[PDB]
């Protein structure tokens, strides 16, 4: 067990995203005091900030992170990686700080087809934004409420691979599932 400064907090201030330069400083981490930001710039790399592009293999380092005290913001993510694998073991977001003061989970404009946050059992505060993920399915099938701390919590889960094409291309809850929800196709995704 170990709690690490996130992006923004501590020396990781002044730094827009998780990236090559800092990523390694998350090795064997448990809780994250702060926010997680994965921006376009993490994969493009930046000349201005003296920063090499990220080997999207190094996202596998996030695998041990159970708690995020602030918020999660994934705007970019490996075009061929189809899932949010790295965050499989992520169990809880506090939302103690929030994107625009509102959003504790932000999954925008990604190539994901499943979300795959299989261990996520609690968003303590803040709302969920799931936008523009052209091929994402399965998000609807879950009961977000079961993940929530107040009435005041919302889901702006708009503008993805319309639920129709899902059932059409057969992208719905695998049969084994106790109809409460899906994070993806296979049995290891029943909410």
């Amino acid at each position: 067990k170990k709690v690490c400064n996130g992006i923004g907090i501590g020396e990781f201030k002044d730094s827009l995203s998780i990236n090559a330069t800092n990523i390694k400083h998350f090795k064997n981490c448990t809780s994250i005091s702060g926010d997680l930001h994965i921006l376009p710039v993490a994969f493009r790399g930046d000349s201005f900030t003296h920063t090499p592009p990220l080997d999207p293999q190094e996202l596998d380092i996030l695998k041990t992170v159970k708690e995020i005290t602030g918020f999660l913001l994934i705007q970019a993510w490996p075009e061929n990686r189809t899932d949010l694998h790295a965050f499989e073991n992520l169990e809880i977001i506090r939302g103690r700080t929030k994107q625009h003061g509102q959003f504790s989970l932000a999954v925008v404009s990604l190539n994901i087809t499943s979300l795959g946050l299989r261990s996520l059992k609690e968003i303590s505060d803040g709302d969920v934004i799931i936008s523009g993920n052209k091929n994402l399915c399965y998000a609807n099938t879950i009961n977000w409420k079961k993940l929530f701390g107040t009435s005041g919590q919302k889901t702006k889960i708009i503008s993805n691979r319309g639920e129709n094409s899902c059932k059409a291309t057969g992208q719905v809850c695998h049969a084994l599932c106790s109809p409460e929800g899906c994070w993806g196709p296979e049995p290891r995704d029943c909410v």
Epitope: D125, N143, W144, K145, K146, L147, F148, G149, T150, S151, G152, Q153, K154, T155, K156, I157
Partner: antibody, heavy 121, light 107 residues
Framework: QVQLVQSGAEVKKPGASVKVSCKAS????????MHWVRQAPGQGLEWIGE????????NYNEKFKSKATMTVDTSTNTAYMELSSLRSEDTAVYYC??????????????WGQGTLVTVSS | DIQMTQSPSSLSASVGDRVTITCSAS?????MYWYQQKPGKAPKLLIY???NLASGVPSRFSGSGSGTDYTFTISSLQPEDIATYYC?????????FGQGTKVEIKR
């Protein structure tokens, strides 16, 4: 469709308890947070707290943490609200109300007929 | 932790008249609701979020204001509008009600 049928009124001597029931008909129960609002007679509304009948999480208003306790029985679509150390000041209409935000983003809002509780000797 | 000052206590006005009920706030407030309680019936949500007219509610009802200042308005008071109206705020996990405003019709 959506209905909240709350238990009948009752009278209690100070010190006693009371478990006020609320049978939620007409919607998918485990889906909406259940609230309890108190109304002292001839008087305004005071919020006691909310219950997420799906996961069991709870949010009380300062004053009521000690007095009230919120519980649910999903098996029979019914939410309860039990009052401790009953005082002459607990005499009021107890309303339950399913208040929430729709997946649609819109607000969700339905109320019981309220259950009168008289504390007297 | 947030403390509401609703005003006025009572209000008499004629049919067709404009009824405006302010409801002020101590610190700042995320979400603002407006409820209507007709005698002997339970509360009824008319407006949520500040201005979003709940479903079914007629046009004459509205609610505005930003910051710590919220107004509720019945542009054209109808007889069936007799009730006491309450605002509530939701901020940082707890709800808080205003004191009420008895609206009464002059005839």
């Amino acid at each position: 469709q959506v209905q909240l049928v709350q238990s009948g009124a009752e009278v209690k001597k100070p010190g006693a308890s009371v478990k006020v029931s609320c049978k939620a008909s007409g919607y998918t129960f485990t889906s909406h947070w259940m609230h309890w609002v108190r109304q002292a007679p001839g008087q305004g509304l005071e919020w006691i707290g909310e219950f997420n009948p799906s996961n069991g999480r709870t949010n009380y208003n300062e004053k009521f943490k000690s007095k009230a306790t919120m519980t649910v029985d999903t098996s029979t679509n019914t939410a309860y609200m039990e009052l401790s150390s009953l005082r002459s000041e607990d005499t009021a209409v107890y309303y339950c109300a399913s208040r929430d935000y729709d997946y649609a983003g819109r607000y969700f809002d339905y109320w019981g007929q309220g259950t009168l509780v008289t504390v007297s000797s | 932790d947030i403390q509401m000052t609703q005003s006025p206590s009572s209000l008499s006005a004629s049919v067709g008249d404009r009824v405006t009920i302010t409801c002020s706030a101590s610190s700042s407030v995320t979400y603002m609701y407006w409820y209507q309680q007709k005698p002997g019936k339970a509360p009824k949500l008319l407006i949520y979020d500040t201005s979003n007219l709940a479903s079914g509610v007629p046009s004459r009802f509205s609610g505005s204001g930003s910051g710590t200042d919220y107004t509720f308005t019945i542009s054209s008071l109808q007889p069936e509008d007799i009730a006491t109206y309450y605002c509530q705020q939701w901020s940082s996990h707890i709800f808080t009600f205003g004191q009420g405003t008895k609206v009464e019709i002059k005839r």
